[PDB]
Amino acid sequence: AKKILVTCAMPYANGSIHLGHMLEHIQADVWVRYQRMRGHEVNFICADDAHGTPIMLKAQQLGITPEQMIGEMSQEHQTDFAGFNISYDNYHSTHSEENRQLSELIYSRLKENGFIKNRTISQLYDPEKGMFLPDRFVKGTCPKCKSPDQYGDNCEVCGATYSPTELIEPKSVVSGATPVMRDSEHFFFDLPSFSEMLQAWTRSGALQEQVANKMQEWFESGLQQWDISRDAPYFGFEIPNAPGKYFYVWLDAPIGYMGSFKNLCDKRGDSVSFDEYWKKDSTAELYHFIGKDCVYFHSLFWPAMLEGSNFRKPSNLFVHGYVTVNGAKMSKSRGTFIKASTWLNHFDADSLRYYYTAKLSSRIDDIDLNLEDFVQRVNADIVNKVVNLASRNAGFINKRFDGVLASELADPQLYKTFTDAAEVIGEAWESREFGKAVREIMALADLANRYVDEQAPWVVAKQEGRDADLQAICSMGINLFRVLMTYLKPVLPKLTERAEAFLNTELTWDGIQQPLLGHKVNPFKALYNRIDMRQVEALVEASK
């Protein structure tokens, strides 16, 4: 009965989706699918983060409009997420009319309420190109060790950090011209005015403990004002009444969460839901799935902007850690920087969804994709525990009993053990204790395969007069499979579809209370095949 708006962080439009993105989108999708299974109104929202100087410059280098470039990357992103069955209700763009109007609205309110401050800043400027240079578009000689061809605010030889104004013989990465210091009036959001409000939220107990602790460090350091403006030339939204000034992506990007929802409402012809979810009196829940590097922004800057423009604030932030592969940060040279598109050439989506889900929890801890363990765990758990309950039993049902399951449960006590677990498993999905849910599900799968082993259908099948026993055993196993696949339905959407076709029924959370009795099932080919390390080796080689 809840109304829930759930987002993932927005992929940048100038790079391909990789396994780090997929950890976040899969985590959110599992949670979203479970909430839908429990009957809630769920809106799962994302968008490409499509503005800014890097995007402007990349399009110029490619010789195409920024609109053409971001459109092509938007399609690529959405193809990859669709390949992993990420079930968004809307995937939009920060470059949209909805976000333009909302960014202009929120800025106007912030300004009228006294939260926008004008400040003159000094920044390196390319006089040939005619633009201010972001730090990483300045290169030069490290002032400390004198190594040439260093970029931005740090030296990759001696490790020194410094302002790029300290680079020796600086050069524009764009044009090669020598940059010079130039003044410009910028507009700053007065985040420090919201410190008391944000401190109250931190101690309210809603946020993850690790996040609340990090926020205390930020309050201790002292909140700063944040620039929300950029000078032309830019790719983004022009600031009303400020010719030559644009909104910086810090302002327009999270408003894209609202723009994407407004777009969804407008496409649906729904004239009430936008205010129902975003006005201050909302009874809807708003949740952001984000990574560690996005916590400052989503926990301090964003709720402050919402408060200052008279909108509701997030109900909670759900933060995950970094992805590692074989224990280390993804490494292009080792072939462990793996694109989502590459993954799907070698493995299915369900395999990675399962593996990540088995490792995830409600804490901020890095998640390791150990590729040897991936092969072992998928084969052990999906092929040999869960799918095995269907594959070892369905053949006898189809070949000797015309596809018909027994009229009664062979072991109702065991079945109740399985359905009694729904409360703890569902609470684990709800609380984002995904690894706990999977551990409980696989413990049940072990019990189910122990039951089948004890009954020994490969013996019963050869013994005269034991047809009824065989049907009873195999039907019991199939009903245990039905329950386990219901618990896994948020995790494994494609296997679930194959399971539903075999079982001739949609899997619903409450449906497990009614076993399949006197019920026709269908034949199937292979519900899920084994994987091997040769495939892992090919994935790594393809990614180098």
Closest CB 157 distance from Zn ion, rounded Å: 5
* 3-class state of residue 18 by DSSP: strand
By the rule CB under 5 A, 144 interacts with Zn ion: yes
Tell me how far, at minimum, the Cβ of 146 lies from Zn ion, in Å. 7
Which CB, 15 or 148, lies closer to Zn ion? 148
145 is in an annotated binding site: yes
Number of chain positions touching Zn ion (CB under 5 A): 8
Nearer to Zn ion, 144 or 439 (CB): 144
Does residue 444 interact with Zn ion by CB under 5 A?
Answer: no
**Measured from the CB atom, is 157 or 328 closer to Zn ion?**
157
Residue from 133, 155, 265, 483 that binds Zn ion (CB under 5 A)? 155
Judged by CB under 5 A, the stretch of 81-89, 140-148, 440-448, 519-527 that binds Zn ion is 140-148
Site for Zn ion in 36-55 (CB under 5 A): none
Applying CB under 5 A, which part among 116-124, 139-147, 461-469, 477-485 lies near Zn ion?
Answer: 139-147
Between β-strands 226-227 and 229-231, what pairing exists: parallel, antiparallel or unpaired? unpaired
Q: How far apart are CA 355 and CA 359, in angstroms?
A: 7
What is each CA distance from 68 to 19, 87, 235, 423, in whole angstroms?
A: 25, 25, 12, 49
Closer CB to Zn ion, 155 or 521, in the complex: 155
**CA torsion angle for 360, 363, 369, 372 (degrees, to 10)?**
-70
- Name, in order, each residue with C-beta under 8 angstroms of 360's C-beta and a sequence gap of 6 or more: 27, 320, 367, 432, 434, 435
d(CA 391, CA 384): 9
To Zn ion, the closest distance from the beta carbon of 166 in angstroms equals 11
CB 237 within 8 Å of CB 24: no
Breaks in the chain after (C-N > 2.5 angstroms): none
Nearer to Zn ion, 141 or 229 (CB): 141
Please state the closest distance from residue 168 (CB atom) to Zn ion, in A.
10
Handedness of CA 235, 240, 244, 247 (dihedral sign): negative
Q: Select the span of 18-26, 147-155, 353-361, 384-392 touching Zn ion (CB under 5 A).
A: 147-155
Distance in Å, CB of 162 to Zn ion, minimum: 9
Closer residue to Zn ion, CB minimum distance, 159 or 412: 159
Smaller CB separation from Zn ion, 160 or 383 = 160
CA 398 to chain centre: 40
Binding piece for Zn ion, criterion CB under 5 A, among 135-143, 248-256, 392-400, 468-476: 135-143
Least Å from the CB of residue 177 to Zn ion: 23
- The answer to whether residue 494 forms part of the interface with Zn ion (CB under 5 A) is no
At its nearest, how many Å lie between Zn ion and the CB of residue 154?
8
82, 145, 424, 538: which one binds Zn ion (CB under 5 A): 145
Q: Which lies closer to Zn ion via its Cβ, residue 142 or residue 406?
A: 142
158 binds Zn ion (CB under 5 A): yes
* Integer Cα distance of 513 and 421 in angstroms: 12
Nearest distance in Å: CB 172, Zn ion = 20
Q: Which stretch binds Zn ion (CB under 5 A): 36-44, 142-150, 280-288, 397-405?
A: 142-150
Task: Compute the distance between CA of residue 365 and CA of residue 323 in angstroms, rounded to an integer.
Answer: 9
Q: Where are the alpha helices (DSSP H) in 347-433?
A: 349-359, 371-377, 387-400, 412-420, 422-430
Shortest distance (Å) from residue 138 CB to Zn ion: 15
Chain centroid, CA 53 distance in Å: 25
Which neighbouring-strand residues pair with 131? Answer: 126
Contact present, 543 and 342 (Cβ < 8 Å): yes
What is the DSSP secondary structure assignment for residue 162, as one 8-state letter? -
Closer CB to Zn ion, 59 or 142, in the complex: 142
How remote is the C-alpha of 27 from its chain's centroid?
6
Out of 32, 70, 133, 142, the residue judged to bind Zn ion by CB under 5 A:
142
Q: For residues 225 and 191, what is the distance between their CA atoms, to the nearest angstrom? A: 5
Question: Under 8 Å CB-to-CB from 391, ≥6 apart: which residues?
Answer: 526, 527
Comparing CB distances to Zn ion, the nearer of 144 and 494 is 144
- Residue from 160, 212, 242, 284 touching Zn ion (CB under 5 A): that is 160
Contact status, residue 508 vs residue 431, Cβ threshold 8 Å:
no
**Which residue matches tokens 């300290």?**
166
Q: 277: which residues sit within 8 A by CB, 6+ positions away?
A: 3, 5, 43, 261, 284, 286, 312
Quote the CA–CA distance of 308 and 302 in Å, as a whole number: 10
Ligand-binding annotation for 265, yes or no, is no
19 binds Zn ion, rule: CB under 5 A: no
Residue 491 DSSP class: T
Nearer to Zn ion, 167 or 480 (CB): 167
Largest CA distance in the chain: 94
Q: Which stretch binds Zn ion (CB under 5 A): 158-166, 316-324, 384-392, 453-461?
A: 158-166
**Residue 474 annotated in ligand binding:** no
The answer to whether 142 and 133 are in contact (CB under 8 A) is no
Q: Is 294 annotated as a binding residue?
A: no
Binding residues for ATP: 332
Binding-site ranges for Zn ion (CB under 5 A)? 142, 144-145, 147, 155, 157-158, 160
Binding residues for Zn(2+): 142, 145, 155, 158
Binding residues: 142, 145, 155, 158, 332
